Design a protein around this nucleic acid. Structure first.
Lengths: 124, 73, 262, 180
RNA sequence: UACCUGGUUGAUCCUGCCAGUAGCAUAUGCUUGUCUCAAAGAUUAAGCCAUGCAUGUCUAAGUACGCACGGCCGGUACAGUGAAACUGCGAAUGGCUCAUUAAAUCAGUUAUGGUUCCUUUGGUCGCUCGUACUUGGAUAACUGUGGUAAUUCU
RNA sequence: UGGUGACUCUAGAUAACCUCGGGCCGAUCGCACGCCGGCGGCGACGACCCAUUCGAACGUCUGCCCUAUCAACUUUCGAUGGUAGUCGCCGUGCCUACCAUGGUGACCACGGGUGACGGGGAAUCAGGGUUCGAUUCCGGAGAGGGAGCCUGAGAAACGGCUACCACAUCCAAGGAAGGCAGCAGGCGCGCAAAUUACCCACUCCCGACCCGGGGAGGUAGUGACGAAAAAUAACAAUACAGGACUCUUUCGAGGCCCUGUAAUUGGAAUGAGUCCACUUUAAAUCCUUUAACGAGGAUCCAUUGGAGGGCAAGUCUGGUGCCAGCAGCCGCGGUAAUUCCAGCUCCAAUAGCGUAUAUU
RNA sequence: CUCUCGGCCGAAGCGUUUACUUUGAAAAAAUU
């Protein structure tokens, strides 16, 4: 109820099909609010569904007042999937990263470098 | 060093295999041996004495028979 | 080195790009092109650091590869493309037209231009040569070789050319009493009238330029760009008219703006 | 190569003579007057004042109509007026050399909290600032060496989350009131 | 902050050094509650290296006859994704170190009217008076048979 | 024709040449398909030659530490110059042939040394100066040492090849394979220096490329190199104790503050830590934000040096007795030791403080 | 300080040449 959302420098980026803005969250009593509440409040603020709003980079000031982050509202989910980084899509469950580490596939790459032809696909 | 995983164990054996060795002088001047296998043949069981066959690796100096042998205990 | 270098450090980058000191180790190394890398804005810095349309270099790549950016009416997808002086950048999706014109302090000011001004550009001709069965050729400051020019156009003159055809519309002769702008040295970005040009054969010839407020300075021929015939410029000028203010006047204007706007 | 900056300064100088009774007494008098932790805070204020006076003395060597001298002199004068060390009437480059260390020590947040009646002692003021009971305008300031600007002095408050401010009494009162 | 103090004599004044004093960098000792930055196998050995990684790369647009595929509709020349391989590019950048080096390197200043230059950008590409509605031989990948104790061998 | 400060420049005209180890003069792919049996709109790969960009490479002028117990050096084997050529991308003893005897030097040539890569810069400093600069930016050099190459626009390349020299790996004894002064790591060396971690999210770079890759770089771990901020407690009432204002000849009488001893009391505020959660981030950690717990002196206990002088702070007490030792220097210690070894107390700086060494 | 070519001025020589001093334009960023 006491959580207040305010928007600094705002721009409609038609080159990436979004609206980008700086968000201040005023929460004088509580802790740093979760991203879901901020997404819902931007959703009711800008009359758009919260499934397309992406927020990040929230730093809480010393003392315990404002929290400043960055937010983007896309036109559709298709543009959001095409233009967000894969990691901010994975925070909403729209991406799945491979479970293989670096060292495993580096060593696999060298091992199949040692072999020639269609036998490359056999090793692993 | 950590001992939690067999990879850490292999790292620890690699570390122990390659160290600067600290040398004790008392070991290096005598001819010592650690008994790997001990066999006994009694001369007389009532006498409770006999010949001992202690087998192991010579580690100190060159082991000469004419010198006396001290068993530490 | 054993061949040409491909990287560029941020602290060794040109200062007019206004790059940070802790964002990275590497600056955008500009690709080879019509402008020197010391005297250009790469498209990544213009789209990301100046216009703020992109937040990262990945977003710059994502905008450029969707074919929205034109430089001199040509779609460019190279994000480190060297864009230079008098240069027209068109973004048709947002309906914006910018000219890269030097700022008063020596940087590339983003100067939004009206769309019918985005049809032409000014070029300083670098050399004249007759080749291939008596055909004369111009070479300009941005490496546009133009065959069959007007015979009155000489070296150090400037030409207004239409970008869609690449052909000369009309030219300004290098002479005293003309309006010019400085592209190099300490006086970079200042606009004034040519007073006189002194000759030093076998060396650099020096030009004296007088400001609209009576301020005189000098440069070389390699740093002069004639932008107007007489006093009226052939292009729109930035918010500052090319008049360099001293630090006292800048401080006074800043305090006046602080007093006016609170 | 790394993306790191290595610019750093030392904010004080150790004195030339280790054991001189007059200097020891004067520094301990400053510490007692202003409730400072050690000699290093005195040396830090002294070093700041020495830098200011060196800058002014370098400025006074130039001609009176020099542009650098005028620009840097008015910059230094406005900076010293804004922290409340110089006054508007005596805003001249010659008066800067007449400045004291005790002039700069009055401008600390500790001294200003003690003077405004928010605290009953200078040590109590340092404690109260360190305990996050003091706010300036709206920011909670935890640093006692916070130099108070002249336009920032008029509103130093009790930081509403504090027990002495709005409410929410602290750990001790909650524990003692929950006895029966 | 433009500074000095102890020590040659019975005592004094000098010359004069030794010692003291403060900073800065390495090392080391004792000690160490919080928070922000942050150098770090240079010095001696440009000594020697187990192991692992550090340079790879496909768009609608060079070559697809590997069912490797869910899969067209079926005489559909080539539907699409596509391992492998050929072709092209890059691997001459970056990173490391400071052994060599004393008008050498390097710095500022100038010349190439004495040279080359992948790439990018612009110019040029019926300006030559002399089977084309498409030319030829292979070679990988694939199938099959092997050699050596051993190799990114063939 | 056009230009330069100056062409043996550019362009023009003529007579020919034009290399089989050969010069350009498109037998290439994609997307939409549409108009008078035939014409076509965009784009991608191409291409001899110009110019442009990134360069690179050879030159011009001036500038570097010590050394004369280095005073003459260079030229048979190019040293200085001329002529013609060879080679080279080009200018040139770059090399050859034929000639001339020149060239550098006390204004320090030549030789030797350097615990010498050079600059940007750093420490210190009144002013002048001294010293440092292996070290992230620019330039050079080199991949154990030398040498010679292939490919290529670009390398005399070393995470390319071929040798020799020195090391060194697997052997079935015939053969085969090497190069951490990359990132971690190990040995050795030493007074002297960190993890065989995670990621390509940021910065950029490479590729046929919006897609792949990057020990570049980023993020954590170690880190008292060094720098910045900053706890270890504050207050109130009483009992003594001072110093002031009023009234008193004075003594004294008070309501005015201050100070510690508190072997006196009292609740309030807290961060350290414990630890949900959010935030941070590629995923984390940390910081920040926050619930809950977390403070009475036997604790949540601050050290390092010193106490004759220089130089701040004991002629205290006990022990030792020219011993042990202290002492940068002057000196102390041989029975009243202000100096040793301890106890107490005191002094300086304080999360820091000693000591050795280089330097100012 | 001036004789010739061009619109009271611009070109051409200067003036024995320097040293000195003042000004102008070139002297990467970072660091100061």
């Amino acid at each position: 109820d006491t959580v207040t959302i305010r928007t600094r420098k705002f721009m409609t980026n038609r080159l990436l099909q979004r609206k980008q803005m700086v968000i201040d969250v005023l929460h004088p009593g509580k802790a740093t609010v979760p991203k879901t509440e901020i997404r819902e409040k931007l959703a009711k603020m800008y009359k758009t569904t919260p499934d397309v709003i992406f927020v990040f980079g929230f730093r809480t000031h010393f003392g315990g007042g404002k929290t400043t982050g960055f937010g983007m509202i896309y036109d559709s989910l298709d543009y959001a999937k095409k233009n967000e980084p894969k990691h901010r899509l994975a925070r909403h469950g729209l991406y799945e990263k491979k479970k293989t580490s670096r060292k495993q596939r580096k060593e696999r790459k060298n091992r199949m470098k040692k072999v020639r032809g269609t036998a490359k696909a056999n090793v692993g | 060093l950590l001992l939690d995983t067999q990879q850490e164990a292999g790292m620890l054996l690699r570390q122990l295999a390659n160290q600067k060795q600290q040398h004790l002088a008392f070991r290096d001047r005598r001819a010592y041996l650690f008994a790997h296998a001990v066999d006994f043949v009694p001369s007389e069981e009532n006498n409770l004495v006999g010949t001992l066959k202690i087998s192991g690796y010579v580690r100190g100096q060159t082991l000469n028979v004419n010198r006396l042998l001290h068993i530490v205990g | 080195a054993r061949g040409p270098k491909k990287h560029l450090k941020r602290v060794a980058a040109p200062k007019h790009w206004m790059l940070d000191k802790l964002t990275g180790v590497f600056a955008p190394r500009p690709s080879t092109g019509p402008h020197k890398l010391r005297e250009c804005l790469p498209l990544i810095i213009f789209l990301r650091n100046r216009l703020k349309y992109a937040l990262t270099g990945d977003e710059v790549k994502k905008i450029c590869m969707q074919r929205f950016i034109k430089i001199d009416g040509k779609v460019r997808t190279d994000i480190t493309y060297p864009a230079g002086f008098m240069d027209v950048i068109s973004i048709d999706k947002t309906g914006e037209n910018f000219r890269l014109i030097y700022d008063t302090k020596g940087r590339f000011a983003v100067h939004r231009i009206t769309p019918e001004e985005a049809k032409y550009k000014l070029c300083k001709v670098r050399k004249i040569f007759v080749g291939t069965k008596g055909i004369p050729h111009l070479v300009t400051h941005d490496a546009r070789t133009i065959r069959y020019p007007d015979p009155l156009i000489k070296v150090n003159d400037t030409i207004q050319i239409d970008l869609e055809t690449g052909k000369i519309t009309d030219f300004i002769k290098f002479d005293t009493g003309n309006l010019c702008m400085v592209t190099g040295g300490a006086n970079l970005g200042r606009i004034g009238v040519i007073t006189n040009r002194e000759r030093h054969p076998g060396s650099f010839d020096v030009v004296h330029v007088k400001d609209a407020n009576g301020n005189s300075f000098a440069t070389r021929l390699s740093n002069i760009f004639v932008i107007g015939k007489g006093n009226k410029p052939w292009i729109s000028l930035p918010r500052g008219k090319g008049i360099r203010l001293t630090i006292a006047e800048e401080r006074d204007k800043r305090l006046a703006a602080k007093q006016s706007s609170g | 190569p790394v993306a790191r900056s290595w610019v750093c300064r030392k904010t004080y100088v150790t004195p030339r003579r280790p054991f001189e009774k007059s200097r020891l007494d004067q520094e301990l008098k400053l510490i007692g007057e202003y409730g400072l932790r050690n000699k290093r805070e005195v040396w830090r204020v002294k070093f700041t004042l020495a830098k200011i006076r060196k800058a002014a003395r370098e400025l006074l060597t130039l001609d009176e109509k020099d542009p650098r001298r005028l620009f840097e002199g008015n910059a230094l004068l406005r900076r010293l007026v804004r922290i409340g060390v110089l006054d508007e009437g005596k805003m001249k480059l010659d008066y800067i050399l007449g400045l004291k260390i005790e002039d700069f020590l009055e401008r600390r947040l500790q001294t200003q909290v003690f003077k405004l009646g928010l605290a009953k002692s200078i040590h109590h003021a340092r404690v109260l600032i360190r305990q996050r009971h003091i706010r300036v305008r709206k920011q909670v300031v935890n640093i006692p060496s916070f130099i108070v600007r002249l336009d920032s002095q008029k509103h130093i408050d009790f930081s509403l989350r504090s027990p002495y401010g709005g409410g929410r009494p602290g750990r001790v009162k909650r524990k003692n009131a929950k006895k029966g």
